[PDB]
Scaffold this active site. Structure first.
Site, PDB file in Angstrom:
ATOM      1  N   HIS A   1       0.820  -1.213   0.000  1.00 46.66           N
ATOM      2  CA  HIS A   1       0.000   0.000   0.000  1.00 46.66           C
ATOM      3  C   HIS A   1       0.868   1.284   0.000  1.00 46.66           C
ATOM      4  O   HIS A   1       0.375   2.401  -0.249  1.00 46.66           O
ATOM      5  CB  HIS A   1      -1.048  -0.021   1.137  1.00 46.66           C
ATOM      6  CG  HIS A   1      -0.476   0.088   2.524  1.00 46.66           C
ATOM      7  ND1 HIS A   1      -0.205  -1.015   3.311  1.00 46.66           N
ATOM      8  CD2 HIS A   1      -0.157   1.169   3.279  1.00 46.66           C
ATOM      9  CE1 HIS A   1       0.263  -0.620   4.487  1.00 46.66           C
ATOM     10  NE2 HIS A   1       0.302   0.700   4.491  1.00 46.66           N
TER      11      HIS A   1
ATOM     12  N   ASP B   1      -0.018  -7.687   1.011  1.00 45.65           N
ATOM     13  CA  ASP B   1       0.410  -6.301   1.200  1.00 45.65           C
ATOM     14  C   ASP B   1       1.929  -6.262   1.311  1.00 45.65           C
ATOM     15  O   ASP B   1       2.497  -6.074   2.404  1.00 45.65           O
ATOM     16  CB  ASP B   1      -0.264  -5.696   2.439  1.00 45.65           C
ATOM     17  CG  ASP B   1      -0.042  -4.196   2.567  1.00 45.65           C
ATOM     18  OD1 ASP B   1       0.558  -3.560   1.669  1.00 45.65           O
ATOM     19  OD2 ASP B   1      -0.484  -3.650   3.589  1.00 45.65           O
TER      20      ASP B   1
ATOM     21  N   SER C   1       3.854   1.340   8.484  1.00 47.62           N
ATOM     22  CA  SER C   1       3.741   0.383   7.371  1.00 47.62           C
ATOM     23  C   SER C   1       5.072   0.090   6.698  1.00 47.62           C
ATOM     24  O   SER C   1       5.907   0.969   6.532  1.00 47.62           O
ATOM     25  CB  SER C   1       2.749   0.879   6.317  1.00 47.62           C
ATOM     26  OG  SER C   1       1.459   1.042   6.868  1.00 47.62           O
TER      27      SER C   1
HETATM   28  C1  KPK Z   1       0.074   0.291  10.136  1.00 55.31           C
HETATM   29  C2  KPK Z   1      -1.247   0.402  10.872  1.00 55.31           C
HETATM   30  C3  KPK Z   1      -1.376  -0.136  12.158  1.00 55.31           C
HETATM   31  C4  KPK Z   1      -2.564  -0.073  12.915  1.00 55.31           C
HETATM   32  C5  KPK Z   1      -3.707   0.542  12.420  1.00 55.31           C
HETATM   33  C6  KPK Z   1      -3.665   1.090  11.138  1.00 55.31           C
HETATM   34  S1  KPK Z   1      -4.935   1.858  10.378  1.00 55.31           S
HETATM   35  C7  KPK Z   1      -4.095   2.237   8.900  1.00 55.31           C
HETATM   36  C8  KPK Z   1      -2.775   1.773   8.982  1.00 55.31           C
HETATM   37  C9  KPK Z   1      -1.788   1.941   7.866  1.00 55.31           C
HETATM   38  N1  KPK Z   1      -2.418   2.444   6.647  1.00 55.31           N
HETATM   39  C10 KPK Z   1      -2.585   3.716   6.291  1.00 55.31           C
HETATM   40  S2  KPK Z   1      -2.087   5.043   7.320  1.00 55.31           S
HETATM   41  C11 KPK Z   1      -1.348   6.380   6.417  1.00 55.31           C
HETATM   42  C12 KPK Z   1      -0.523   5.885   5.222  1.00 55.31           C
HETATM   43  C13 KPK Z   1       0.871   5.374   5.611  1.00 55.31           C
HETATM   44  C14 KPK Z   1       0.750   4.025   6.259  1.00 55.31           C
HETATM   45  O1  KPK Z   1       0.382   3.122   5.477  1.00 55.31           O
HETATM   46  O2  KPK Z   1       0.996   3.899   7.493  1.00 55.31           O
HETATM   47  N2  KPK Z   1      -3.174   3.935   5.097  1.00 55.31           N
HETATM   48  C15 KPK Z   1      -3.432   2.707   4.606  1.00 55.31           C
HETATM   49  C16 KPK Z   1      -4.011   2.264   3.422  1.00 55.31           C
HETATM   50  C17 KPK Z   1      -4.116   0.891   3.193  1.00 55.31           C
HETATM   51  C18 KPK Z   1      -3.651  -0.038   4.144  1.00 55.31           C
HETATM   52  C19 KPK Z   1      -3.063   0.370   5.352  1.00 55.31           C
HETATM   53  C20 KPK Z   1      -2.931   1.733   5.622  1.00 55.31           C
HETATM   54  C21 KPK Z   1      -2.453   1.070  10.287  1.00 55.31           C
END
Ligand code: KPK
Length: 220
Positions: free
Chosen positions: A45, A89, A176
């Site tokens: 992602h 992913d 991530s």
């Molecule tokens: C890494 C993580 C841990 C716990 C809760 C959550 S909620 C969202 C994320 C990480 N995330 C995010 S957060 C901002 C973007 C950077 C990132 O991926 O951390 N956007 C996403 C889109 C698709 C899949 C995952 C994504 C995330």
């Protein structure tokens, strides 16, 4: 990283910081890790139209002579990655150039146990908190696939289930692509969790992908 502590500076010489630039308005960051001088492993992602890897960093605002900053020339996201299940992913990135292996930039060697793990990242330290300048690490307990039941699309074969629900500690937004390390071995990759930060969070199971991985590194 929520509820972690600052890494000792440069203890994780494999940690990549990524600056992703999206075709729209650019601006997001992910973690990663160097696995070959010219290959970085990260979550799918985190793809964008361009990426800049900063290796060697600890406080990512402060420039220092351990740094090596490189552009990504090819994005190798898993052919089966699906944006609405978040399965597969996983993405490999080819750097423009071979990084120099220094003390602070090096690869990652390609009763509870055993299932005691660490993760580090520069991501958010709370639900609407800022990210971290300094690289943060947290100790997380790996779990039974029953703990991640509420995540409608979890697959025990493809993914790992990380963190004690009774605790605040977790990888979070901006973490991530980060590697999960259980008794020294990289076992997982930060993928997603609930936006309210409540553990467990889902990570990609690396073990499932070693065949597709070594496939990318054999060409290229
Ligand atoms: C890494 C993580 C841990 C716990 C809760 C959550 S909620 C969202 C994320 C990480 N995330 C995010 S957060 C901002 C973007 C950077 C990132 O991926 O951390 N956007 C996403 C889109 C698709 C899949 C995952 C994504 C995330």
């Amino acid at each position: 990283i929520i509820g972690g502590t600052e890494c000792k500076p440069h203890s994780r010489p494999y940690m990549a910081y990524l600056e992703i630039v999206t075709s729209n308005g650019p601006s997001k960051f992910c973690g990663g890790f160097l696995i070959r001088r010219n290959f970085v492993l990260t979550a799918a992602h985190c793809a964008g139209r361009s990426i800049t890897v900063t290796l060697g960093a600890h406080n990512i605002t402060e420039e220092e002579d351990t740094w090596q900053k490189l552009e990504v020339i090819k994005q190798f996201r898993h052919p089966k990655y699906n944006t609405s299940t978040l399965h597969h992913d996983i993405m490999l990135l080819k750097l423009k150039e071979k990084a120099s292996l220094t003390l602070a930039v090096g690869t990652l060697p390609f009763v509870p146990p055993g299932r005691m793990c660490r993760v580090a990242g520069w991501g958010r330290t709370g639900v609407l908190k800022p990210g971290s300048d300094t690289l943060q690490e947290v100790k997380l307990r790996l779990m039974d696939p029953q703990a991640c039941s509420h995540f409608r699309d979890f697959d025990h074969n493809l993914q790992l289930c990380v963190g004690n629900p009774r605790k605040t500690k977790s990888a979070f937004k901006g973490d991530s692509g980060g590697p999960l390390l259980c008794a020294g071995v990289a076992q997982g990759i930060v993928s997603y969790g609930r936006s309210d930060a409540k553990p467990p969070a889902v990570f990609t199971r690396i073990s499932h992908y070693r065949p597709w991985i070594n496939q990318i590194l054999q060409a290229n």
